[PDB]
Amino acid sequence: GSYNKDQQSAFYEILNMPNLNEAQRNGFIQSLKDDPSQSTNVLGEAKKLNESQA
């Protein structure tokens, strides 16, 4: 389906994370699609995961 410019932005941040593997990257992208209301929490967890695998 379609997305607003905020949702597009969340995808973009996760899409570009250099330390996630492809399973993790797509898992978090899937979560963004699953529940838009959780966008901020989901991005936060993805960031923490990304940072820990640096």
């Binding site: 993790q24 899937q30 979560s31 529940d35 967890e45 995961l49």
Partner: peptide
Amino acid sequence: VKGRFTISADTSKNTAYLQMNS
């Protein structure tokens, strides 16, 4: 589990889901 898991539902498939990351 906030931020790591997401719940969703597809009513046409009458199925619910739990995505689990991190």
